[PDB]
UniProtKB/Swiss-Prot annotation, chain B:
The gene is S. This is Spike protein S2'. It comes from Severe acute respiratory syndrome coronavirus 2. Residues 4-48 form a coiled coil. Changing S37A: In strain: Alpha/B.1.1.7. Subunit of the fusion protein that is processed upon entry into the host cell. Mediates fusion of the virion and cellular membranes by functioning as a class I viral fusion protein. Contains a viral fusion peptide that is unmasked after S2 cleavage. This cleavage can occur at the cell membrane by host TMPRSS2 or during endocytosis by host CSTL. In either case, this triggers an extensive and irreversible conformational change that leads to fusion of the viral envelope with the cellular cytoplasmic membrane, releasing viral genomic RNA into the host cell cytoplasm. It comes from the Viruses.
Length: 49, 49, 49
């Protein structure tokens, strides 16, 4: 659970290392102009397809 | 009553018209400025429509 | 297609609740009694304050 931070998604997005960046209900580049109550970060590893 | 009922009918028709703005009609949010504020135009277009 | 992929899913909540994580847009001074386009912690709009 991440909260009380200035989430700089613009730096995170423009990195070419990421192979899939798909956002639903929010455009991937306007995220830097919105404020959020709490952001949950889930992480795991799966296969490609 | 013949004079009060027309005033009440018009006031209630206007009140229903105003309340219709809080409906989503299938959009992710009824507030037009917020969906324009978080979705990019090419995909915000349908939520607007 | 079968190589592993690390996946992080960021979930954003947007309830009628206090916001805490905000994109790092610098704050500005407040002007009252003027028609301005405001953005209060993610709530956007145009009006006189």
């Amino acid at each position: 659970r991440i909260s009380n931070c200035v989430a700089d998604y613009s730096v995170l997005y423009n990195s070419a290392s990421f192979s899939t960046f798909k956002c639903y209900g929010v455009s991937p580049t306007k995220l830097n102009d919105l404020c959020f109550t709490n952001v949950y970060a889930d992480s795991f590893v799966i296969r490609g397809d | 009553g013949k004079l009060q009922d027309v005033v009440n009918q018009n006031a209630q028709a206007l009140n229903t018209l105003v309340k219709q703005l809080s409906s989503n009609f299938g959009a992710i949010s009824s507030v037009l400025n917020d969906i324009l504020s978080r979705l990019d135009p090419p995909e915000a277009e349908v939520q607007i429509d | 297609g079968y190589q592993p992929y690390r996946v992080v899913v960021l979930s954003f909540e947007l309830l009628h609740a206090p916001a805490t994580v905000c994109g790092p847009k610098k704050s500005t001074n407040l002007v009252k009694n003027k028609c301005v386009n405001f953005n209060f912690n993610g709530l956007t709009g145009t009006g006189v304050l």
